A paper describes a structure:
In this work, we have solved the X-ray crystallographic structure of L. interrogans glyceraldehyde-3-phosphate dehydrogenase (GAPDH) to 2.37-Å resolution, a glycolytic enzyme that has been shown to exhibit moonlighting functions that potentiate infectivity and immune evasion in various pathogenic organisms. Besides carrying out moonlighting functions in the extracellular space, LiGAPDH is a glycolytic enzyme located in the cytoplasm.
There are two independent tetramers in the asymmetric unit that are nearly identical, with an r.m.s.d. of 0.30 Å. The N-terminal domain adopts an α/β/α Rossmann fold characterized by the classic α/β nucleotide binding pocket, which typically contains a central 7-stranded β-sheet and a tightly bound NAD+ cofactor occupying the active site. Another key structural feature of LiGAPDH is the S loop, an extended and irregular segment comprising residues Ala180-Ile207 that inserts itself between the NAD+-binding site and the adjacent subunit. The catalytic Cys152 residue is located at the intersection between the N-terminal and C-terminal domains, where it interacts with the side chains of His179 and Arg234, the two other catalytic triad residues, responsible for lowering the pKa of the Cys152 thiol nucleophile. Inspection of the eight active sites in the crystal structure revealed that some of them had the Ps and Pi sites occupied by phosphate anions from the purification buffers or glycerol molecules from the cryoprotectant solution, which acted as substrates or substrate analogs. The crystallographic structure agrees with the solution SAXS data, suggesting that the crystal lattice has trapped the native conformation.
Residue numbers in the entry:
A (entry chain A), C (entry chain C): 1 to 334
B (entry chain B): -1 to 334
D (entry chain D): 1 to 333
Write the structure that this text describes.
């Protein structure tokens, strides 16, 4: 049984917990956040986006009790003061958003944790980044003790890029994500030290945003390094995002051939990772989807035999959370 | 001085905003409004605007007219444009903004009713109606022959000036556009039927909704040099007004974002003044509510992959900018 | 087995269909709407609010196939031309919004239907109105061939009123409902001859609206006839509403005592109709709730021993759709 | 000229600044917030709700330059270390939300300010609360050095209560406010130790909230103390709220008479505070209104001659900000 601790019981932390408490192979031993177990228990059972927790939730002054299983609840701002050694934590899910650099994420290993999974792109280039179904086989159990699971957008874009790249090559690519609002944005216009637009009211605006997903894809798919960039527009929805990839391929092809390969990948080497649809879907048709990427056949367009606009959905919350579990399960086995 | 007589068929978002923008012009004379509701509901919707605020002036009504700033305007309720009294009113231009008469057969009812010229506030349903975008191809207008015209779409009016600047300076090999578009009256609040686009029937408050757009092809019409070289799509999002275009374009000559921004800023200060705007500020959509521009180039949001591959971003108030272009086109046609 | 046809496959019609199609005692034989089976099947499969249909959906040019069941699909503007006599319809669910008067509803009877259930308050004083768990025992099989299941708000308010009246009496009561947006509202400012406010954009505004639910409960609970009125505020939410009842009681009492009686009723009589909670719930905690009314203890306030403000939630879509089934089932058995 | 500093350049602080920088009798000398002048210049210039600043906005490392006027920008978390004596600050607008107690607000006076106006209800009983046009005349310049301007909801409800009470008395009143989302709420579900609902996603939910605004009216209008209580529902709108008041009056009356008195007040002794409308209004019809309260005659309902439901709108951002300025101008005269 693999022992897991969660640092940051937020949107991602609670969703990895919800997805993982079902697995007998996993054991969640601790949750760390800046609030009491009462509020953690409330946020676990009630979810404005993914519905009520399908199970029993209780709490003590010192723990949550989920389906009878006891999980320790601690509240320490500094990860170094966490009891990871006493709980002998194998994996710590770093999902606070505040320790995406190595010096901060190294604090969990100092506390006694064996492996640290950062649920976000790393700020340092020396932390390996993995996307399940793209480059997770490059993981080194003997050396990679702090890893990154990339971004929700990277996890959506990289599988699409991989199928296109494998079959027709990519000369150039520009991506746009139309992304759901997240917790980093305020409800009304407010301060924002390093991105002024990011402080504008998320309920009111379409908001241009930077994304690192494109080059992060360059990390996971080196063959596309230097050939893709991207940006983002935050829109006033609470969850589910979509990627629009304009691609110039090397070989001539058509949308029918691309769709054939996407469908094949979704049924084969990327089943459970890449999804495929021909239906007239809109974003809420993917609420609580566990897939990283859902290729939208009807929304795609072809300018000509080498220029395409490919569209893929993702639940930026639920899909990433399940990938976080998938990566841990992989690391534990291999 | 001399006055152009205008009637509005369809007193909706575009119709009321065309009225708001044009009633300030002393050379224009709005002589009639046609819609399916009595002047009482029309006065109410004219007075109060959830997006552009209260009407800055006095609005009253009778059973047969609105009274705006002392001026009386005839208010009729006739579904059939053919039964409208355009001949009696000596209507020079009819703004067809109901959304139901974008083909020649439907718009021709206004000419049969007596109007001299008809401006469709939308893309024509068929290529047999000429389309004009101010500052791009409105000089190709023929006063003696083009009696039914189209002012294209908001997206076309935003995309085309960008395309024009890029093409004239570096050429275009390919261009793929996406518009992130505000919600409009064609979408319901909750999931409902929609025969012509199933996605079009899903709830607008809840979803990102992929949609089809003809704006790319329409620009190919207004700019023949670019025909076949541009396509596009749309995503409707839960905002009530203001949209943004994201154009992925491959140029012929090598260039850079600095050079492109230089030409965009030059165009906005020169030949496309009042049509194309230019900004370097960290703007978001609500910063353009009630903007009169067709297209506002957003230098900070643009990205360059390489010397020939760029992602250009341009905003537009799909209600207010288009309504101001409808008036400009009518003014242009009047002068010649 | 009871044979049911649905006129108007909209929000209410589709949800009634979702809740009932698993029922072996019910047989849905026909669906009538203004579109062909492909759009109806699409709308049955994907719901922006209640998620994907948990089952299989197929279609023909003339029929739907749900979980193997074949349902005829028609498109007739005039109910009088519907094949109810030929299909032997026991109950017709009138959920178009256009035939809530007796002359309009009677067209289903002339076409061959035996019973018509209007999914809204009737425009006619001689059409009986029932709220399950409040006054449905007054249904007379021999005379009530066209009945009304009231409004979603009436089904929420009446259970609250029933308990308070039965235990402490009601001298006066004023109701306010904060109501989710519905299909009658536009996305942007537009015309609306019978209620100008109703035409204003639902995404942007709090919109005052009139409601008849207050007098309608006077119909179902005659003891309160003439003693309560109400109003409504439409807000930019796609589903779930809340009732805020300001009530002057006859006998002295306390919030503790009221909550205790609400809790008893939720666990015994009115079980499945009235729900009870002491948690810090918000509207999305009730998406796809099947209850008519959920009493919110913590949201309630007491001015004094005879003046209370009681709060109760309801999924105006799902709860009402389930009560339409319950009403049909009650009528069917006797 | 009155020398004013703003502590907390947020929604209220910036909107107070916009309305007041136009006033030649006022002199804004300093702004304190936790961000650099660039971000403050940005937020002053562009407003998602009230549009672009109608004027010129410039900034340096150490100041804002608004319409030619130079204003100091400081970034100090502890108000005791603020440069109020050097700047000779007459009034400090406390709009951070973190110093609504006397121990906290008094730090501005310890720092050199003469008066402190809190843009929110005070925590302490000994800090007087004023509503313009209701009880502001009770201000005592010799002793009231820290005052509260109450809440946006109290400023909307109290004028309504005053006219009803003066004409027909109040036996009971229960108020509900349908309130716009504010900076206190997250976009998505998150923690909130003292009120769990307050942490739920504001874009997707109707959110019940506690309010003291009814009880505050009991303080500003002592005759109604113990007779009025209330609650709140936060809804997914960015601005403008509405109060809904269920009132049992003492004297028999009618909606027609109440409306007449409301219209009389809006035109007379509460012009600029109380507004009156008979139109079919909705929330966005009041964006950027400077009124505290707008009586909505058509939305009102009468159960009988003594039981009414009265409805009044308010721009919780813009109306309150103007009340803060009005209070400062009153205290300075
Ligand atoms: N939201 C998404 O869709 C998404 C997708 C992929 C990855 N991510 C990444 O996951 C990370 C978390 O995102 P989220 O949306 O769950 O955010 P969130 O704000 O919902 O959760 C973060 C949580 O961390 C807790 N926390 C903060 N500081 C802490 C500390 N010092 N110690 C312990 N707990 C602390 C907070 O109370 C909060 O609940 C971010 O870095 C984000 O970029 C988010
Ligand atoms: N909304 C935008 O941003 C935008 C911008 C550019 C172009 N347009 C075009 O303008 C047209 C109208 O757009 P809108 O947003 O104003 O729509 P809208 O829903 O506001 O409708 C326009 C008006 O037409 C009236 N109408 C309907 N049938 C009529 C009839 N038979 N006779 C007279 N009036 C009738 C309606 O009552 C309505 O008020 C569409 O063709 C649209 O494509 C819209
Ligand atoms: N949505 C709610 O919260 C709610 C709650 C309780 C009851 N209701 C009542 O139920 C009724 C339906 O409301 P809704 O929200 O489902 O509306 P809706 O607009 O979602 O669905 C109504 C359907 O009627 C169909 N229709 C229209 N004309 C028709 C005709 N002539 N013949 C056949 N079908 C026709 C339409 O295509 C449409 O799908 C209303 O009367 C409403 O007041 C609504
Ligand atoms: N927004 C409304 O509708 C409204 C109406 C009436 C009253 N109020 C009250 O006014 C106050 C401000 O609310 P708001 O909506 O403007 O909030 P906001 O979050 O928009 O602004 C608060 C500001 O305080 C500043 N701040 C935080 N800590 C600080 C510190 N230590 N020193 C200096 N500045 C600091 C922050 O950067 C932030 O800009 C609150 O007390 C609120 O309850 C708000």
């Amino acid at each position: 049984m693999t022992r897991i601790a969660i640092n940051g019981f937020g949107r991602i932390g609670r969703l990895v917990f919800r997805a993982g408490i079902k697995d007998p192979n996993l054991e969640f031993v601790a949750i760390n956040d800046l609030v009491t177990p009462d509020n953690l228990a409330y946020l676990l059972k009630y979810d404005s986006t993914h519905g009520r927790f399908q199970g029993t939730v209780e709490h003590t002054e010192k723990e949550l009790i989920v389906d009878g299983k006891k999980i320790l609840c601690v509240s320490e701002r500094d990860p170094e003061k966490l009891p990871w050694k006493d709980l002998k934590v194998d994996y710590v899910i770093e999902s606070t958003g505040l320790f995406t650099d190595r010096v901060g994420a190294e604090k969990h290993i100092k506390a006694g944790a064996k492996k640290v999974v950062i649920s976000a792109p790393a700020k340092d280039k020396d932390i390996p980044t993995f996307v399940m179904g793209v480059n997770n086989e490059k993981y080194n159990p003997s050396n990679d003790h702090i890893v990154s699971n990339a971004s929700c957008t990277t996890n959506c874009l990289a599988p699409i890029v991989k199928v296109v790249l494998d079959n027709w090559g990519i000369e150039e690519g520009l991506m746009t994500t139309i992304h759901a609002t997240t917790a980093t944005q305020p409800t009304v216009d407010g301060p924002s030290k390093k991105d002024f637009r990011g402080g504008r009211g998320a309920m009111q605006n379409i908001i241009p945003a930077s994304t690192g997903a494109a080059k992060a894809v360059g990390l996971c798919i080196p063959e596309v390094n230097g050939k893709l960039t991207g940006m983002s527009f935050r829109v006033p929805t609470p969850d589910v995002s979509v990627v629009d990839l304009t691609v110039r391929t090397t070989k001539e092809t058509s949308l029918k051939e691309i769709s054939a390969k996407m469908k094949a990948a979704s049924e084969g080497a990327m089943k459970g990772i890449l999804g495929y649809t021909e239906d007239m879907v809109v974003s809420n048709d993917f609420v609580s989807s566990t897939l990283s990427s859902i290729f939208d056949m009807d929304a795609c367009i072809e300018l000509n035999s080498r220029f395409f606009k490919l569209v893929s959905w993702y639940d930026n919350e639920m899909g990433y959370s399940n990938r976080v579990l998938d990566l841990i399960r992989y690391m534990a086995k291999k």
